[PDB]
PDB file of C-alpha atoms and ligand atoms in Angstrom:
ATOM      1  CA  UNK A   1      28.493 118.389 136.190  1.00 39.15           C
ATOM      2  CA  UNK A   2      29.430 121.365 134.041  1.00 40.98           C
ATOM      3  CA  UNK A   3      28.273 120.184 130.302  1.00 38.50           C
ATOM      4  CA  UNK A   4      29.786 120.454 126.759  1.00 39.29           C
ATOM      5  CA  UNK A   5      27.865 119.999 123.534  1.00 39.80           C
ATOM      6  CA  UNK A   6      29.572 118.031 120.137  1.00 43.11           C
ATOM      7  CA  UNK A   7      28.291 117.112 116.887  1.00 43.00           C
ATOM      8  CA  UNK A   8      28.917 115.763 113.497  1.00 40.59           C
ATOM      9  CA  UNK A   9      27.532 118.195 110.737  1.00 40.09           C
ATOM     10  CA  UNK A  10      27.171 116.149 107.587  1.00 42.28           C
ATOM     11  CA  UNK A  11      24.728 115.362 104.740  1.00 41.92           C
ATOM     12  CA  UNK A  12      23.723 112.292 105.049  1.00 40.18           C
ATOM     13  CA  UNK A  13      24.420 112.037 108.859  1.00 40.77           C
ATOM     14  CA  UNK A  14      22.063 108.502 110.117  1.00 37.08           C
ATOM     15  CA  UNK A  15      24.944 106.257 109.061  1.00 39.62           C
ATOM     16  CA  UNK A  16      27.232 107.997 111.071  1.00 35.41           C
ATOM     17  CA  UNK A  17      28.639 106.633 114.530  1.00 34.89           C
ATOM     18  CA  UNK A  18      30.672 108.920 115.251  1.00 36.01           C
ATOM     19  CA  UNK A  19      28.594 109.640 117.874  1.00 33.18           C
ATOM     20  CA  UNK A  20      28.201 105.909 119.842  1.00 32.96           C
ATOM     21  CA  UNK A  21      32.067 106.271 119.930  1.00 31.85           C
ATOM     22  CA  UNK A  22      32.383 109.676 121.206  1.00 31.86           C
ATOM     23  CA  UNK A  23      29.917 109.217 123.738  1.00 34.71           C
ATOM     24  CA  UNK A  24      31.228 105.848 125.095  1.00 38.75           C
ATOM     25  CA  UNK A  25      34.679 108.572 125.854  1.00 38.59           C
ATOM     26  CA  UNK A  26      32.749 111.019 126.960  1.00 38.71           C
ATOM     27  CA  UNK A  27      31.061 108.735 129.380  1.00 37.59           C
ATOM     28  CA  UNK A  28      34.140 106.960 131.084  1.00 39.02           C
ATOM     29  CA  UNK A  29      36.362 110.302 130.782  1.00 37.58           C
ATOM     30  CA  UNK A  30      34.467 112.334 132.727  1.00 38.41           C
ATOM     31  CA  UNK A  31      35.804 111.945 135.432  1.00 37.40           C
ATOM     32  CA  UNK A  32      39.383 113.308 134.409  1.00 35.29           C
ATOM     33  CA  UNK A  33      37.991 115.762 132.307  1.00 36.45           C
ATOM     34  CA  UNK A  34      35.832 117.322 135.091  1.00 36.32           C
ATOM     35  CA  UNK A  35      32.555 117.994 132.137  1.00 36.32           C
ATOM     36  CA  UNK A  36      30.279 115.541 131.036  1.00 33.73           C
ATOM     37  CA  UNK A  37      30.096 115.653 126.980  1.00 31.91           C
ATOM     38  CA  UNK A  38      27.375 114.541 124.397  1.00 32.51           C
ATOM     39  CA  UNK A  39      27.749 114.284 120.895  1.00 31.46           C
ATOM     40  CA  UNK A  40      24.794 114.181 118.261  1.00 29.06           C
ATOM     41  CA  UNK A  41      24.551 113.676 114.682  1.00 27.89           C
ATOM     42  CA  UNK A  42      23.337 116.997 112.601  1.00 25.88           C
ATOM     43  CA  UNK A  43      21.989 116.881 109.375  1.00 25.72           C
ATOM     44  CA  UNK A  44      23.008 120.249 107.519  1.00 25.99           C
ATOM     45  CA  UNK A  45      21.037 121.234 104.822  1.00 26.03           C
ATOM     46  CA  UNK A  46      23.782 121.530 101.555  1.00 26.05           C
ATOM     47  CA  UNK A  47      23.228 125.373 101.569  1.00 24.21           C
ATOM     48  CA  UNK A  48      22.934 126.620 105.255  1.00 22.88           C
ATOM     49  CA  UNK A  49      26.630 127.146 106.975  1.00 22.23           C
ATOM     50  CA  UNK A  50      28.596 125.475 109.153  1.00 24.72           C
ATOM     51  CA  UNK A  51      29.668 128.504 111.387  1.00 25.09           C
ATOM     52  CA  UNK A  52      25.828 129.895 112.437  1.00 23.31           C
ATOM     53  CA  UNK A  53      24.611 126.564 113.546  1.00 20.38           C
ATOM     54  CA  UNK A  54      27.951 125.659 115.123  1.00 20.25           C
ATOM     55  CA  UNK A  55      27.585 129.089 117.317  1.00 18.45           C
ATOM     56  CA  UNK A  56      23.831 128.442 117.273  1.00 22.45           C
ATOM     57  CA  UNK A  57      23.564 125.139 118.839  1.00 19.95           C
ATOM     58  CA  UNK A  58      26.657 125.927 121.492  1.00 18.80           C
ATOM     59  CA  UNK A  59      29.090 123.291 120.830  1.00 17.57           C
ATOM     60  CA  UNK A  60      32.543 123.378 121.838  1.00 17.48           C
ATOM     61  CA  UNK A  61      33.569 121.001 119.099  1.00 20.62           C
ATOM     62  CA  UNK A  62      32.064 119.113 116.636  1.00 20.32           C
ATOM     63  CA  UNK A  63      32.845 116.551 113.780  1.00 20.59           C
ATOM     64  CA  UNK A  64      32.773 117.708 109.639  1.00 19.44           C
ATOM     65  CA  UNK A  65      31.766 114.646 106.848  1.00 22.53           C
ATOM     66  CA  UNK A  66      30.510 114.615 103.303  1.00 22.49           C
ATOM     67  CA  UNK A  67      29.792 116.864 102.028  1.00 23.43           C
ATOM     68  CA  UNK A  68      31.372 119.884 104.065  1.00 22.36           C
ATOM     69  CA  UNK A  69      35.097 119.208 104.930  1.00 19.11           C
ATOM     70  CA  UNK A  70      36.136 121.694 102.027  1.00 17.95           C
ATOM     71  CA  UNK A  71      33.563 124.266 103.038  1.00 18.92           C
ATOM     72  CA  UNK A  72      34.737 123.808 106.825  1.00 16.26           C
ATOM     73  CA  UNK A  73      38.538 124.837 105.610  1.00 17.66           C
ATOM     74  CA  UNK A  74      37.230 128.002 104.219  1.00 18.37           C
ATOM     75  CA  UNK A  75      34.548 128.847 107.368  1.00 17.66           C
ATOM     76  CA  UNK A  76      36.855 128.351 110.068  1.00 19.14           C
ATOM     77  CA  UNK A  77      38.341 131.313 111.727  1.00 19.64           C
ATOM     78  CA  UNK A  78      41.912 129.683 112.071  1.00 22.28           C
ATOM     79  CA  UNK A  79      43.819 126.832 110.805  1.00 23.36           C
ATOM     80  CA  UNK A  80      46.070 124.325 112.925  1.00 26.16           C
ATOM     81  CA  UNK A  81      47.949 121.314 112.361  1.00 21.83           C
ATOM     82  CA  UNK A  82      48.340 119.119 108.728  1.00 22.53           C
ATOM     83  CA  UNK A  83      44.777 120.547 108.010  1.00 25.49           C
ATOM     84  CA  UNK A  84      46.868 123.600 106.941  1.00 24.45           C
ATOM     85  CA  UNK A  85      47.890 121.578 104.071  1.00 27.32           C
ATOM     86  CA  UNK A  86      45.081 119.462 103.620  1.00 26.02           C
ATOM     87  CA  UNK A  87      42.020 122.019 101.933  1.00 24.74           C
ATOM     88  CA  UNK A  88      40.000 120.431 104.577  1.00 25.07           C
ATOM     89  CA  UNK A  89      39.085 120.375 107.796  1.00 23.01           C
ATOM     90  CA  UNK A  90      36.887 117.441 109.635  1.00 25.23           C
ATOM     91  CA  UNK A  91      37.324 118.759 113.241  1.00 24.99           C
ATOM     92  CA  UNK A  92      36.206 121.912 114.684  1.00 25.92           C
ATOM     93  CA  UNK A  93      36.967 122.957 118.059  1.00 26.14           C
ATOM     94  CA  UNK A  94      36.067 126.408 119.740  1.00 26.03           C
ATOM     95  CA  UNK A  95      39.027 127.802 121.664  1.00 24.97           C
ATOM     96  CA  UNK A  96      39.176 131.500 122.563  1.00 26.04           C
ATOM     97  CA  UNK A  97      36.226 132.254 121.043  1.00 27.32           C
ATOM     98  CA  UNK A  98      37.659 131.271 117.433  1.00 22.71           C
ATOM     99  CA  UNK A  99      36.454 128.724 115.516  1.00 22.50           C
ATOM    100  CA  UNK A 100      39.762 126.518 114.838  1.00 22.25           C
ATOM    101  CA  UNK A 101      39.748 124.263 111.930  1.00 23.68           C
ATOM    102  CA  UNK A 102      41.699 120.482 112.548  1.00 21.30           C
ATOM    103  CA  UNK A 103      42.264 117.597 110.252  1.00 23.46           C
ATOM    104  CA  UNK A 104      42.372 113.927 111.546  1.00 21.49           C
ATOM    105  CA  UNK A 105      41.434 112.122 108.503  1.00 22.23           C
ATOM    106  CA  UNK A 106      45.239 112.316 107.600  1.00 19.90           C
ATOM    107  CA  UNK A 107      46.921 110.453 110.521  1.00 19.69           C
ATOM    108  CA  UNK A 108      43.994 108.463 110.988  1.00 19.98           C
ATOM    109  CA  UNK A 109      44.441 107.054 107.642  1.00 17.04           C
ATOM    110  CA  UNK A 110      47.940 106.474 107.997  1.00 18.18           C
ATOM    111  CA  UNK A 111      47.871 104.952 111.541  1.00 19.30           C
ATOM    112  CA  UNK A 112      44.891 102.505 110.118  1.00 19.23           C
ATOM    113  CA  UNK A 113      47.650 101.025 107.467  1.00 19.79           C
ATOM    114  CA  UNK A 114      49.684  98.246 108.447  1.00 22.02           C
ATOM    115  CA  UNK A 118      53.919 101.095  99.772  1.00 23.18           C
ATOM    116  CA  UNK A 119      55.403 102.950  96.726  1.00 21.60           C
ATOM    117  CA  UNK A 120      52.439 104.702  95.020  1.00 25.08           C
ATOM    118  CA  UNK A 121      48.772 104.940  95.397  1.00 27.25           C
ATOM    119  CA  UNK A 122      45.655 105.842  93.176  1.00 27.42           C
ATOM    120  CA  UNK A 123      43.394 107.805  94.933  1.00 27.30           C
ATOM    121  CA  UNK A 124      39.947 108.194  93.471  1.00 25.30           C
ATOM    122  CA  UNK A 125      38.156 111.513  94.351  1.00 22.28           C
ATOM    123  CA  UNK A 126      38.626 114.958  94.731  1.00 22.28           C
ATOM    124  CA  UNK A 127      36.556 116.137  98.048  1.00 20.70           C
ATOM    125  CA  UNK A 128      38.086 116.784 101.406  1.00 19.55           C
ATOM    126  CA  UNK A 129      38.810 112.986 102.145  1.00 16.24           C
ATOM    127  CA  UNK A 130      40.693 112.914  99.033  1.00 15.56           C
ATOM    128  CA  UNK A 131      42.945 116.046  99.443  1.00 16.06           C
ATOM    129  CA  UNK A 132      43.620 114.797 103.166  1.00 18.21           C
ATOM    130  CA  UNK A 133      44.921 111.249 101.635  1.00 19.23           C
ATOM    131  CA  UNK A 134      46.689 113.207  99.188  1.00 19.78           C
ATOM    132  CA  UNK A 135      48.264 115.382 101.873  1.00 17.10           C
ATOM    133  CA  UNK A 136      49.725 112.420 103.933  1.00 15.40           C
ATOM    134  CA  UNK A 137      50.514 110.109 101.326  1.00 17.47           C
ATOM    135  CA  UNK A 138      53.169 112.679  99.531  1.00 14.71           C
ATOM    136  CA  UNK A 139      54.394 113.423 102.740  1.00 16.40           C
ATOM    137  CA  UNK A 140      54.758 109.332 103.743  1.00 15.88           C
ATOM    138  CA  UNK A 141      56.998 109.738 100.205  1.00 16.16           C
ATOM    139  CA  UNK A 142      54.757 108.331  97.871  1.00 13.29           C
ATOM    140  CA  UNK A 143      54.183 108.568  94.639  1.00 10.24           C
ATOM    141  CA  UNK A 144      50.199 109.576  94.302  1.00 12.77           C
ATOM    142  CA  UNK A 145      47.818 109.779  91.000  1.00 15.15           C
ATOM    143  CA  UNK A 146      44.633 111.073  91.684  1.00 16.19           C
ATOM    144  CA  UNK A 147      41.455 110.068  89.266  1.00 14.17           C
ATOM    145  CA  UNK A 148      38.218 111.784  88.747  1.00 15.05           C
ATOM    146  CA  UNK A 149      36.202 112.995  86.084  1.00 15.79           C
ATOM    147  CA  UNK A 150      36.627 116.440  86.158  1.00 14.17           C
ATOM    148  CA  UNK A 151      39.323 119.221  86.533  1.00 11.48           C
ATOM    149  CA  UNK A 152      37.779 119.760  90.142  1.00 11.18           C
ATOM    150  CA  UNK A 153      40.728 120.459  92.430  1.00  9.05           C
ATOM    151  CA  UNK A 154      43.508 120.052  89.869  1.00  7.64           C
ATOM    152  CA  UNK A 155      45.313 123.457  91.665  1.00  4.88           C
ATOM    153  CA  UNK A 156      45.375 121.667  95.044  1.00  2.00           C
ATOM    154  CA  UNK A 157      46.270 118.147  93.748  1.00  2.00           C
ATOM    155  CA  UNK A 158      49.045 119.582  91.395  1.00  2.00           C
ATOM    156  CA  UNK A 159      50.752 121.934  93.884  1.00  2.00           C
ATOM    157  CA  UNK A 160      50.726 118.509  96.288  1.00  2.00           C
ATOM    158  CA  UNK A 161      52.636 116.837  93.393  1.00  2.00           C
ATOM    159  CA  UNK A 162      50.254 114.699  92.612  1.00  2.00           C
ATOM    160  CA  UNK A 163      49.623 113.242  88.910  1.00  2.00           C
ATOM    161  CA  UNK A 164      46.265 114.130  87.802  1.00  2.00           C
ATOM    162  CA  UNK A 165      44.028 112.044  85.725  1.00  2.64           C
ATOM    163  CA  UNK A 166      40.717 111.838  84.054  1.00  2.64           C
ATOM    164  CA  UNK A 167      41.484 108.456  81.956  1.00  4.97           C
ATOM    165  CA  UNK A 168      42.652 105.860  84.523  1.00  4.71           C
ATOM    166  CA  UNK A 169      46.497 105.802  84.306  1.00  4.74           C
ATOM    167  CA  UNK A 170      48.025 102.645  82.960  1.00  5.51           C
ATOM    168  CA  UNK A 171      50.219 101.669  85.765  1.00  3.42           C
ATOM    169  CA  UNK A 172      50.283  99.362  88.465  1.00  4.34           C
ATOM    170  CA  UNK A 173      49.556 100.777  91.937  1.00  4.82           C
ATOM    171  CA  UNK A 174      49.879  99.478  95.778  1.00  2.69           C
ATOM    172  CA  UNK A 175      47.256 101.185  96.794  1.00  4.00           C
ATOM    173  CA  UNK A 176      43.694 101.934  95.173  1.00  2.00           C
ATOM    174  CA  UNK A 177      41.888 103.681  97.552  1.00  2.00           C
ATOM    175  CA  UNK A 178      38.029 104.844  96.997  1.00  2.00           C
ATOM    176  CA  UNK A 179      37.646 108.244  98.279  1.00  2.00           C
ATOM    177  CA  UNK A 180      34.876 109.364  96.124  1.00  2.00           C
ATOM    178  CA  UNK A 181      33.208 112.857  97.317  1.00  2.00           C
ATOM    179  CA  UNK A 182      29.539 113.414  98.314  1.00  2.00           C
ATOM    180  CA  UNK A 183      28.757 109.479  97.381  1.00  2.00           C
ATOM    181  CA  UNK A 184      28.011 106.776  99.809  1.00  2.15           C
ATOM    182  CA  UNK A 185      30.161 103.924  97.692  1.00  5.49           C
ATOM    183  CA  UNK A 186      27.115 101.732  96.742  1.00  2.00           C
ATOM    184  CA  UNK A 187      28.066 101.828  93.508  1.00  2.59           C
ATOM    185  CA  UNK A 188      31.616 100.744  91.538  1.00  6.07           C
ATOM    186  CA  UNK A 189      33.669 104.010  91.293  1.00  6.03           C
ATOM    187  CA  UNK A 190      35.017 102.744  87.930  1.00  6.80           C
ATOM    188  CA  UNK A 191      34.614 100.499  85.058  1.00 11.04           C
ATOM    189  CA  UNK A 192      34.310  97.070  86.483  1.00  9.76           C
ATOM    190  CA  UNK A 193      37.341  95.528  84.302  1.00 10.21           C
ATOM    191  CA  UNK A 194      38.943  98.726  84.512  1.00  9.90           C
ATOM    192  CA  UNK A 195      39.206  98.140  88.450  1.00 10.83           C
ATOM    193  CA  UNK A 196      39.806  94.407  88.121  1.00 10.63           C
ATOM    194  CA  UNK A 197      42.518  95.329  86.124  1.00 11.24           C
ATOM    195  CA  UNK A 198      43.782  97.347  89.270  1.00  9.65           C
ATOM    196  CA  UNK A 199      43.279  94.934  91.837  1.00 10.91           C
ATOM    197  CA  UNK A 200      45.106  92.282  90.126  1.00 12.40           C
ATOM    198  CA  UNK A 201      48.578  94.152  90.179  1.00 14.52           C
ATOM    199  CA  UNK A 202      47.445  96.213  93.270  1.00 14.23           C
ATOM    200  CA  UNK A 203      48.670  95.408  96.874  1.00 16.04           C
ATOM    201  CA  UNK A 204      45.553  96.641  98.780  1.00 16.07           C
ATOM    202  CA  UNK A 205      42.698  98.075  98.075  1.00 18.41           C
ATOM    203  CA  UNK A 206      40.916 100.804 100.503  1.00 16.81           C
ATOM    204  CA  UNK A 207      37.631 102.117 101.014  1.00 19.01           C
ATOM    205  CA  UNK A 208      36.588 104.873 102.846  1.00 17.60           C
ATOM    206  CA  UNK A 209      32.831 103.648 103.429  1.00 17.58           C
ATOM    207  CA  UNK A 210      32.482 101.750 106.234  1.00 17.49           C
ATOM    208  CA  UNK A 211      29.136 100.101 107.833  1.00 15.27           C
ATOM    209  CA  UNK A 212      28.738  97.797 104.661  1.00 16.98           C
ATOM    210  CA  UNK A 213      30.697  96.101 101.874  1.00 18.74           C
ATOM    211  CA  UNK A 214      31.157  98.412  99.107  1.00 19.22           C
ATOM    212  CA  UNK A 215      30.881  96.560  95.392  1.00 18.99           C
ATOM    213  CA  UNK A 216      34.559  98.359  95.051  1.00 22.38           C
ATOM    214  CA  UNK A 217      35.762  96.231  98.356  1.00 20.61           C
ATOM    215  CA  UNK A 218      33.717  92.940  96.547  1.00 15.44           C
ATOM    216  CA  UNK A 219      35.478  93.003  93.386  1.00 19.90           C
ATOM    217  CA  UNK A 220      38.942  93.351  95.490  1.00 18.59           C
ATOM    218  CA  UNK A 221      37.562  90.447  97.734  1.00 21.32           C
ATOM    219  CA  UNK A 222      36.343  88.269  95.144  1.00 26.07           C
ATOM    220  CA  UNK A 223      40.361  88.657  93.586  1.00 26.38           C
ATOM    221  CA  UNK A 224      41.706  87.508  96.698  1.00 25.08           C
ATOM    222  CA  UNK A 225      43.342  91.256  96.499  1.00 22.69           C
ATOM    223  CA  UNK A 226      43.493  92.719 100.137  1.00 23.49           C
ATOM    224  CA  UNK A 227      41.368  94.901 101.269  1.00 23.84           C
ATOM    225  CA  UNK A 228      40.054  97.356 104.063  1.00 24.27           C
ATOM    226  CA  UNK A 229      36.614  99.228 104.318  1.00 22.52           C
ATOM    227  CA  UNK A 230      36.992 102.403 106.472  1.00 22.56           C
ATOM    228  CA  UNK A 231      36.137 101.143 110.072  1.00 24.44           C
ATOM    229  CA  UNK A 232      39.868 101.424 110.994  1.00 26.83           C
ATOM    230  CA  UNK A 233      40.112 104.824 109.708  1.00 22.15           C
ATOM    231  CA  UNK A 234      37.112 106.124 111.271  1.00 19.58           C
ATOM    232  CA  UNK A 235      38.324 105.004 114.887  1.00 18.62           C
ATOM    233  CA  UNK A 236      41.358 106.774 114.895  1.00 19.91           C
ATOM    234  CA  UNK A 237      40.634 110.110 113.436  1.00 20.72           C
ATOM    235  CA  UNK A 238      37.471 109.913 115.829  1.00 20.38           C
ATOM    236  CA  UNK A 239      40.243 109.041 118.697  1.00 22.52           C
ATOM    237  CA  UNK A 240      42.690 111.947 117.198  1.00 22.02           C
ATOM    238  CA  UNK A 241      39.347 114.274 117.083  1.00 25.07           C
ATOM    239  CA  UNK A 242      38.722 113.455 120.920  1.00 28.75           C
ATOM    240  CA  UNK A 243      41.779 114.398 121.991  1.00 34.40           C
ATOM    241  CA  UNK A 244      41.668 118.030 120.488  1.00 35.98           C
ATOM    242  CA  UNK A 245      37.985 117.756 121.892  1.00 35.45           C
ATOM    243  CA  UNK A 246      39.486 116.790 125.338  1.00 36.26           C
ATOM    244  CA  UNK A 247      42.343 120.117 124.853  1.00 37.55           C
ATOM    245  CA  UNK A 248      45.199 117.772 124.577  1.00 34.86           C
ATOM    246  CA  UNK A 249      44.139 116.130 127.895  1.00 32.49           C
ATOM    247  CA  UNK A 250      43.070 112.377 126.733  1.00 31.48           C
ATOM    248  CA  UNK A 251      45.545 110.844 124.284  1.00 28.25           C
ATOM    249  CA  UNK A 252      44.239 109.542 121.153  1.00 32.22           C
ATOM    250  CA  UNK A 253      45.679 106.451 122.019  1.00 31.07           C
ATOM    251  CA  UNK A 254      43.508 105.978 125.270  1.00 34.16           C
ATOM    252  CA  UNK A 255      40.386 107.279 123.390  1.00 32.47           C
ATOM    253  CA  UNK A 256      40.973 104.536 120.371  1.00 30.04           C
ATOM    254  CA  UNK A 257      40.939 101.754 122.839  1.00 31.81           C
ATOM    255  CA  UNK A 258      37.521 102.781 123.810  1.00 32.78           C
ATOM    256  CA  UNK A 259      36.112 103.387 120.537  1.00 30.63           C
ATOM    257  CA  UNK A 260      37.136 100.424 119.015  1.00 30.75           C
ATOM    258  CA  UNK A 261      35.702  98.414 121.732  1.00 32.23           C
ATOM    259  CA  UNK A 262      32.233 100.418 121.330  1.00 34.66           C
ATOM    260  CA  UNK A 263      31.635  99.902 117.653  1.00 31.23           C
TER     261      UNK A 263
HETATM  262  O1  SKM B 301      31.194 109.042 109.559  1.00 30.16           O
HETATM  263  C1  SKM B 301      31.701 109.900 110.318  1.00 30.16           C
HETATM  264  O2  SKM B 301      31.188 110.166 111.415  1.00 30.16           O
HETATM  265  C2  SKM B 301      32.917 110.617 109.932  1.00 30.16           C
HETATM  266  C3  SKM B 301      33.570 110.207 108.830  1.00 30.16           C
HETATM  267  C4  SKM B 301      34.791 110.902 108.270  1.00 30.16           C
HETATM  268  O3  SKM B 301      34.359 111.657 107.127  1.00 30.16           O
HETATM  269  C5  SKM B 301      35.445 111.784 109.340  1.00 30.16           C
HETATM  270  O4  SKM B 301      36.404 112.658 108.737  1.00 30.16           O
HETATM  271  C6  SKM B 301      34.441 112.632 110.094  1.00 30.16           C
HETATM  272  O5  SKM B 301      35.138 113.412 111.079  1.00 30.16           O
HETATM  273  C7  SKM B 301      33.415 111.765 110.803  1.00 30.16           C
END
């Protein structure tokens, strides 16, 4: 069988599974894509860059997570899709020998929602994407961090930008927080009770474990989702652009999901 090689370039990269899901396609879609792929997990050091080892190691498309998805918008030979308007990219696919630059984090997340505004806390790739998708849903979006760090991008979005948490009620509180794993609470305990109690759902990007931020919400009896949904479908949305349009996302969620 003629062979591809994939990846996901990240740092940390053991919790991901990106790769037991893209596998499982790879595996059972063989046959209609006429190449056997395999994905593995690579650990980039913070400093190195994403375009030598991508070109190094051979891959004809690979995965982007914390704490790169910025840094992959600005390597990437060409831009295509939402990712245009997202300061991010998560996918990378090699077509015509240029490095093109994708973003599924921003359909993923909005196919994994079953809303008027939204606080999104963060201001790394995963936040600009939610930013992205939630202005264009027609949203109202504030945007909380502790820093200036990507007022330009938020700001020309339309977002509101804060470094004191806004006092307003919000539907959605989602956790986005950049290069962090979401052990810990994002915000002041009260401060996110507070939140949750005149919140509609609140969403966490983490997936794998129960983040404290997804406790408190629990513990409210506020609604909540961790990121597993998420995940799937910009893994499914990734496979397809993997696949050149060939495999629908919609075939490659089904056997994702079933996988992890
Ligand atoms: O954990 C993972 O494998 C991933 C998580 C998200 O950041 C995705 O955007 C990324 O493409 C893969």
């Amino acid at each position: 069988m003629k062979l591809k090689s994939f990846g996901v370039f990240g740092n940390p990269i053991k919790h991901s599974k990106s790769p037991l899901i893209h596998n499982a396609c790879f595996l059972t879609f063989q046959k209609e894509l006429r190449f056997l792929g395999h994905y593995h997990p690579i650990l980039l050091p913070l400093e190195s860059h994403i375009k030598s080892e991508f070109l190094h190691l051979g891959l004809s498309g690979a995965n982007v997570t914390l704490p790169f998805k910025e840094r992959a918008f600005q390597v990437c030979d060409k831009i295509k899709g939402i990712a245009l308007e997202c300061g991010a990219v998560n996918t990378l696919v090699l077509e015509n020998d240029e490095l093109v630059g994708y973003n599924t984090d921003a359909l993923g997340f909005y196919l994994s929602l079953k809303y008027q505004n939204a606080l999104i806390l963060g201001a790394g790739g995963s936040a600009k994407a939610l930013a992205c998708e939630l202005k264009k849903q027609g949203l109202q979006v504030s945007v909380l961090n502790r820093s200036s760090r990507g007022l330009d991008f938020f700001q020309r979005l339309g977002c509101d930008c804060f470094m004191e948490p806004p006092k307003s009620a919000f539907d959605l509180i989602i956790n986005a927080t950049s290069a962090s794993l979401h052990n810990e609470l994002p915000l002041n305990k009260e401060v996110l009770k507070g939140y949750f109690k005149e919140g509609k759902l609140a969403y966490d990007l983490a997936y794998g474990f129960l983040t404290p931020f997804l406790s408190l919400a629990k513990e409210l009896k506020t609604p909540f989702q961790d990121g597993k949904d998420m995940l799937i479908y910009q893994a499914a949305l990734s496979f397809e652009k993997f696949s050149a349009s060939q495999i629908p996302y919609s075939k490659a969620f089904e056997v994702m999901r079933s996988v992890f």
